[PDB]
Amino acid sequence: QRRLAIVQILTTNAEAIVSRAAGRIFT
Amino acid sequence: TRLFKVTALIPSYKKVRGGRELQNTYFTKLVEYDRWFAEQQRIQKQGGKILSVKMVA
Amino acid sequence: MQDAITSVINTYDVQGKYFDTSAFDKLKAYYATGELRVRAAGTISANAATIIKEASAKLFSNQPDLVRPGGNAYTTRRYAACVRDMDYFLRYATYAMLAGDTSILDERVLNGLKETYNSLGVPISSTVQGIQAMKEVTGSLVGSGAAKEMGVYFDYLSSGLS
Amino acid sequence: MQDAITSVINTYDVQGKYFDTSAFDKLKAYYATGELRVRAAGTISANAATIIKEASAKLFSNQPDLVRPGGNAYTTRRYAACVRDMDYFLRYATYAMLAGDTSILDERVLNGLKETYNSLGVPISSTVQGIQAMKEVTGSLVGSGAAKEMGVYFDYLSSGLS
Amino acid sequence: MQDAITSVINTYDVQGKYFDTSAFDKLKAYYATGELRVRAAGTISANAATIIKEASAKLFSNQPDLVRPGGNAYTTRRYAACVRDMDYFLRYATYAMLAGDTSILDERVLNGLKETYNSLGVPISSTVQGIQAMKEVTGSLVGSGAAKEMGVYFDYLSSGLS
Amino acid sequence: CSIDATIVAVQEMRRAATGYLKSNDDKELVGSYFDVIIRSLNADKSDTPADVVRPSSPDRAGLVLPAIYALAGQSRPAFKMSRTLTSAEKERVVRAAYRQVFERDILAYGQSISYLDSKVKNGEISVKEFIRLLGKSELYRKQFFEPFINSRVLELAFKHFLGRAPESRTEVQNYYSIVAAQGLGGLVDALVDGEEYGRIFGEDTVPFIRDLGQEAQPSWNWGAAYSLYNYAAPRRKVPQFITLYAD
Amino acid sequence: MQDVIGKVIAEYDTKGKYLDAAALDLLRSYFDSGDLRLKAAQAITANAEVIVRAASAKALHYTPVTKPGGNMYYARRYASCIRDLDYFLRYATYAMLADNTTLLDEYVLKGLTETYRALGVPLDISVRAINALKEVVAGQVGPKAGQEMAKYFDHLAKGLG
Amino acid sequence: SVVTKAIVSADAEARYLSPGELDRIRGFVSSGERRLRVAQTLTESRERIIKQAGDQLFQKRPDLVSPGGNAYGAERTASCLRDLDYYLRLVTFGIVAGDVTPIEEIGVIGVKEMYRNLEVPLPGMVEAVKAMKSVATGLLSGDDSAEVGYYFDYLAGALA
Amino acid sequence: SVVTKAIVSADAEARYLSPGELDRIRGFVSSGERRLRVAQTLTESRERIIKQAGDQLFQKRPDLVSPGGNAYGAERTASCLRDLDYYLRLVTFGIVAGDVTPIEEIGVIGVKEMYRNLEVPLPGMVEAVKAMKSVATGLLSGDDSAEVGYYFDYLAGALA
Amino acid sequence: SVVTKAIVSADAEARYLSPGELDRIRGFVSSGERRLRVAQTLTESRERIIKQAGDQLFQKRPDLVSPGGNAYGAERTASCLRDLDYYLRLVTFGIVAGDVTPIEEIGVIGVKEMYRNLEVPLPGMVEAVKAMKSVATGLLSGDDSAEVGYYFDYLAGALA
Amino acid sequence: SVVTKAIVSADAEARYLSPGELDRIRGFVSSGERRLRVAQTLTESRERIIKQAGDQLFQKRPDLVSPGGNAYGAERTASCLRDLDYYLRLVTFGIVAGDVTPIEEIGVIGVKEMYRNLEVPLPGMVEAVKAMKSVATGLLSGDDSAEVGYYFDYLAGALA
Ligand SMILES: CCC1=C(C)/C(=C/C2=NC(=C\c3[nH]c(/C=C4\NC(=O)[C@H](C)[C@H]4CC)c(C)c3CCC(=O)O)/C(CCC(=O)O)=C2C)NC1=O
Ligand SMILES: CCC1=C(C)/C(=C/C2=NC(=C\c3[nH]c(/C=C4\NC(=O)[C@H](C)[C@H]4CC)c(C)c3CCC(=O)O)/C(CCC(=O)O)=C2C)NC1=O
Ligand SMILES: CCC1=C(C)/C(=C/C2=NC(=C\c3[nH]c(/C=C4\NC(=O)[C@H](C)[C@H]4CC)c(C)c3CCC(=O)O)/C(CCC(=O)O)=C2C)NC1=O
Ligand SMILES: CCC1=C(C)/C(=C/C2=NC(=C\c3[nH]c(/C=C4\NC(=O)[C@H](C)[C@H]4CC)c(C)c3CCC(=O)O)/C(CCC(=O)O)=C2C)NC1=O
Ligand SMILES: CCC1=C(C)/C(=C/C2=NC(=C\c3[nH]c(/C=C4\NC(=O)[C@H](C)[C@H]4CC)c(C)c3CCC(=O)O)/C(CCC(=O)O)=C2C)NC1=O
Ligand SMILES: CCC1=C(C)/C(=C/C2=NC(=C\c3[nH]c(/C=C4\NC(=O)[C@H](C)[C@H]4CC)c(C)c3CCC(=O)O)/C(CCC(=O)O)=C2C)NC1=O
Ligand SMILES: CCC1=C(C)/C(=C/C2=NC(=C\c3[nH]c(/C=C4\NC(=O)[C@H](C)[C@H]4CC)c(C)c3CCC(=O)O)/C(CCC(=O)O)=C2C)NC1=O
Ligand SMILES: CCC1=C(C)/C(=C/C2=NC(=C\c3[nH]c(/C=C4\NC(=O)[C@H](C)[C@H]4CC)c(C)c3CCC(=O)O)/C(CCC(=O)O)=C2C)NC1=O
Ligand SMILES: CCC1=C(C)/C(=C/C2=NC(=C\c3[nH]c(/C=C4\NC(=O)[C@H](C)[C@H]4CC)c(C)c3CCC(=O)O)/C(CCC(=O)O)=C2C)NC1=O
Incomplete structure (x- = not known):
């Protein structure tokens, strides 16, 4: 249940994380 | 033997x-006994060294 | 094999997308039953021999001809093989219950079961009856809540044979 | 395997009955024939190589094609495999004669052999002719009664290959 | 497996014939191309990694769905298995070219390959595309005549899978 | 691609995901799950880990398996006798040996070779000699020699002692020569004392089935091999490998 | 091979008496240190190749053993040396989790010494490599866990020596 | 039987039966008439042997028919006697076969697992087999009793 | 112990302990205080538990104390008490160890032949162990009684 | 064949051919012209070689064609000479192949079993192939005679 | 001997002698007198048997006595007769032991390779053994000559 809560947190915020990494390394 | x-x-x-x-x-x-010739050949072909052999019976 | 988690992960990996609401619902449903299923698995693991005893007693009382001369279970060897098959069915039903999936039953039981029982002459209907008897005994032993979960996989085995 | 005594034991075990007069008559028949069977078995064991030699010479004289280029028995290896098959046929016919039953010929010779020869391209008609030649050669060495008895098992092999 | 020499030897052995003028013509023709074959095999051994890499690039460019989710190249594990199969095909095409006969391609590669891929879920058409990519890559590195020769065996593999 | 750019990106996602968690255990767990990416990328500074090669004879093809393919957790647990093990896992290894040779544990019938079990447990014989004496016993002869013709005996003995199917016409040919000449004892001796057995299992490891994921799999015997690696294999009496390689 | 629990159960079965207060206290001592041992196990498991690599660099790389005529002079012999260091690290981790040195003797020290004689392996360079591995492991896992790892590593060293 | 054992021993070695083996079959078929007489004597006296063996067992082991016993009750006692009947039939089969092979195939393989699944004590089985040994060897002459006693002994050892 | 099994399985596949095995050892060490408390609780109950198990066994299986039973006789009671004590000690050793290997090694591997030597019925063993389990679970808390139930039912199943 | 042998040696350990294997294949294909010339000469002279070899064999060992012998009679002498023709064809096959593989796969595996099934004396076959080696190497030049003698001598040792 | 095979078979199954092996031992001890009479008759008349058998062996094959055969020569004939003397001891040993294991342990295992080293033909062996069998069955009584012929047939089949 705790791991599923963590997974929910990361899947809600997935786009932000990927875009942030891309911005850090691209353009 | x-x-x-x-x-x-x-x-x-x-x-x-x-x-x-x-x-x-x-x-x-x-x-x-009947197997030892073949087993010795297998050990020698594998490159292994036969440290010792003794007669039990 | 697979489990419920592997099935969900592969379902959402072949599409290439994160877990949606239905994924989290399935995972929650699987996790909610987890402690009940573990308790049932422990009870069955500690008490497999008993379940086999009463289940075989019920089967051979319902169908005496099996253990009389001319029956497929008439020999000490064939009686032992019968109870051994019952132990297989119980153990693999427990594995499937814990896995939450029927992949292990298809892979490791049903694959080659019809050929085996048709080559040996084992009665498939009587085997279905024995699996049903293990179903009632296990349900009585592990409680109704775990009884339903285990009966799902017992019914899977029974419908796999017949 | 199964032999005459074991066959009677099995047919009275399946029905669950004790031995009766008919079973004792069958057992007594086998026990009476046993001495002749043992003499025949010793004669064939002493002369197996000669029987194979003569039967193979007969077959390859009648059908020279099998050992000419393009024949199934054309190489030293394929010829040796052929005579090995004939040796096995003779030895197992001897085993079945000594046992009094044809179970070993089924389970240990003929179960899967005809499909093996169809895959391999072995001419099964020529093989049956060779088995018949073995029967003819063996009968002369064993005498009339043992010839009838061993011809039973040779014909069983020939018909089983069919 | 067999090379061209062994193929001629077998085709004259089944007929029970000595080598005639045509047989010596075929053997001389094979011996004429031996140095070219050795040179091409050495070159392909030197450049096998390059060929596999660039052919895999061409295949996954023309078949983008393979590496996307749901494709049979979609993971590093599954991708690595694909490139290992590519190495298999190049190695066995080199073997067949050096032997001068397609017997090794049928015996060690093509037999049972469609069934294995059907069991695994591998797409046979994409495998054929990868093999054609291999052919396109290898021709340039080996030159005109060696490209014709090695393209014969790549075509044999493609037609075996197709 | 740039490996440094990838490592920076994975570190950035690690930091970002650690940001949203607001719990030390969750942060460290996700940090480990990103540290595995970083560690694998750093570990592949040299080439990728070497592919496992299965060697072969001149009759059958030599195959490779990427090391990535094997380490998905499906590798079978080797049952080894260490001569210093206590009684429980010694019995565990013995039961594994019985399951391998007889396709199933025959304690279900009360059948065992007690003196062989004692010899293998106490170290008088090794696991290889135990397997050989176990395949040459009256029990094995009754289960897997009597009901079968020599070709089927050959194939099932490959499964029971080499953990694999026959891969060549030359292989079934040679082992049929051996069985037809010398019986079950000769066949079992030929299988156990071969180079492949010592290569794969050795003196102290019980044989196991070398099916998908354990080693590289041959393509040419796939259907027959996976028919053989099935508990319904003894229910078939017709040989399936001599017929296939002739077909 | 046995754990601390196995050892105390064996002792009290030989005596034939139930687990008294002393045995329970030793069991509590083992279980209380369990979290520390598991954390050090995490650290060793994650960074095992790094640790072995550092040990080889500090103990073996630029000594004459890697030079021609040295015991490590081959790709195969060097790989075998690194493989042996992997053995030592993994089985030291096993011994730590077991909190006992019996598995080291039964699994690692059973016939190793005279095998090294026969192969020509030097004992002293092996002990030096084990000591270097111990230093690297202690550095990675901190003082508390390094103290426990030190017992198993110098047990290996004494077994070699 | 003896013939089957000899033939399978030769078959597993890919050879014809040795002269010693053929002497085995010769001696075995020579003694066929005696074995048939012994089996006939036991078969004709089956019903009396069962009852005397049951009486001896229950007098020696009253617990089995005592309250809380395994054979307590009419149906359970009948099943006990039915098992004794099975094993007497198996002994006759083994006598005519000349070896314990029928006893081993029909009655010995898996007997302990069977009776464990039936909560049937094994010492009670051994005592019953000993009682039936006594009753059956009482009928036969000394030479025939010595022959039958060994089949009963193999049965007792298998049950124990 | 759980750690012993984990280490053996890790060596079997020739790699460090998996996260699943590491979490298994995590749960094992985290539950050490509770398991030791349960084992200590089993100790203060020495004569109590032994006698309720004994007389429950006598009620359930009167044949054992009835004439003709293997445990019939006053002298047999002295061995009964110490045998039940041995099995209880093995149960406690398994409880602290976290696995049934001490039970298997000390009192199960070879118990079958041992009680065959003494002519002891295995059903007596299963009924006695069930009586012990009933008494112990009755004394212990439900959560802990569930954990001890695996050990006691393993003892019963292995004894038969 | 040499090429097939190299390819299977490479395929055994899953690799492209080593430089030594390519070198041996290069040497084999470099010697193709003399191999074809020798095989062409032997095929051209098959009748002469078989005739002279049969004459020398029958003179050296008259007992083969003596009454009671294996080759006695026109038909059996014809079979005897047909076997020599077989082995000469196999030797030419092995010459073009570069190794004794066709010779072994056609006329060496099981040859002892075959000739024991025919009452054909093995020493007679050794003498026949030795005489045929003598006759054949008589026709060929000095360098080629040795390499043909290697094949004939392998076959002689195989029969012996 | 027979007790040897029974004992080793009992060892292979880790129990006492099964009833068929008991029948072995009973028949073997009961038939010791007649087989001892056979052995004494064979050893007392060995000198005549070997010389006569060599005579009809020389008669059967004119080729053997002819030059170029191993039989030709005075000392070579003495060696042949000495080999026949060796084999007669082995047959008597087998008759005493009731099995062919003394025969196998001397002169059966490896006999083909030995005679190939000696260049001695094997058909000569089988026909010589037939000669000894025929000369032995003449003087010896029919019941004894039966089993003697079985042993000689086994030894010849081993040679053939
Ligand atoms: C986990 C996968 C798996 C399954 C399913 C399995 C079943 C199985 N049961 C077998 C025998 C048997 N199975 C039975 C089953 C009983 N017959 C009665 O009528 C009942 C209806 C029925 C059970 C309630 C019997 C009587 C035999 C003996 C058949 C014989 O030997 O002829 C056999 C043949 C091997 C042996 O005798 O031990 C197999 C393979 N084995 C496996 O590895
Ligand atoms: C989660 C487990 C997993 C990953 C991530 C994975 C990545 C992956 N990326 C690929 C292609 C590629 N990947 C990249 C680069 C990207 N790669 C990233 O690590 C960088 C953030 C980024 C560039 C900075 C590029 C440019 C390609 C094109 C083909 C090539 O590189 O040759 C390929 C080869 C298949 C193809 O050509 O489409 C794989 C297997 N595979 C896996 O099983
Ligand atoms: C020497 C002859 C030979 C061949 C050819 C052969 C093919 C083969 N490919 C396999 C897996 C595979 N093969 C492929 C390759 C395909 N996937 C597609 O996307 C591409 C079109 C293509 C890659 C270019 C893949 C992806 C797998 C992995 C299947 C899986 O893991 O589910 C496997 C099973 C795994 C193993 O090797 O043990 C076999 C046997 N085996 C042989 O012995
Ligand atoms: C005991 C039960 C049993 C039998 C009998 C048996 C027979 C058998 N015969 C074989 C080959 C053969 N068998 C024969 C014999 C036939 N061809 C001749 O023309 C004759 C007409 C005829 C015999 C009289 C020949 C010529 C071969 C060689 C075929 C080949 O190598 O392709 C083979 C394949 C050997 C290989 O791998 O090459 C088998 C398995 N197998 C068994 O498990
Ligand atoms: C798990 C218990 C275990 C241990 C301890 C073990 C050690 C071990 N190391 C070996 C080889 C070797 N080991 C070494 C390493 C040594 N030489 C270097 O100089 C160092 C000083 C030192 C290591 C720190 C070398 C160089 C070889 C190759 C020996 C040779 O090929 O001659 C071998 C011979 C088998 C093989 O080569 O695979 C063993 C048994 N094996 C085990 O199963
Ligand atoms: C031919 C091989 C063979 C045997 C031997 C065999 C025995 C056998 N005995 C059974 C029951 C029984 N057997 C007994 C006998 C026991 N009572 C006492 O404890 C004694 C120790 C012991 C007898 C001396 C009893 C009392 C039952 C009834 C128990 C029940 O209701 O399950 C059953 C259950 C089905 C039935 O009652 O018909 C079988 C199958 N079955 C076979 O196919
Ligand atoms: C720690 C492992 C261990 C166990 C378990 C063990 C049991 C054991 N019990 C024995 C005697 C015995 N034990 C019993 C008691 C049993 N039999 C009856 O059937 C009752 C149902 C039941 C009592 C509940 C009896 C009846 C005997 C034979 C005579 C006696 O009472 O001492 C003996 C023979 C030596 C002796 O008299 O002490 C042993 C070895 N020994 C061990 O080292
Ligand atoms: C290509 C491989 C191959 C070979 C070599 C081969 C030899 C061969 N020789 C045969 C007969 C024979 N072979 C010989 C030759 C021997 N006689 C003397 O002893 C000499 C020492 C010696 C010749 C130098 C004779 C005389 C026969 C006739 C035997 C008879 O028909 O009774 C036969 C039986 C032909 C038939 O059915 O009638 C074969 C198959 N077959 C093959 O497929
Ligand atoms: C009891 C075990 C045993 C056996 C079986 C045996 C056979 C045997 N006979 C020998 C001599 C011989 N034996 C013969 C007789 C043969 N020539 C004819 O074909 C006869 C049919 C045939 C009769 C067997 C000849 C000719 C030699 C001389 C060979 C030589 O010394 O070069 C030799 C070599 C002795 C020597 O010269 O130093 C052996 C080993 N010896 C033994 O110790």
């Missing part, structure tokens, strides 16, 4: 093994 007690060490030259393989390389075993 029934049994031979053979202490032998067979090293490895074709590769390196990740598993334990320590008893597989050095070991002492009892071998029957």
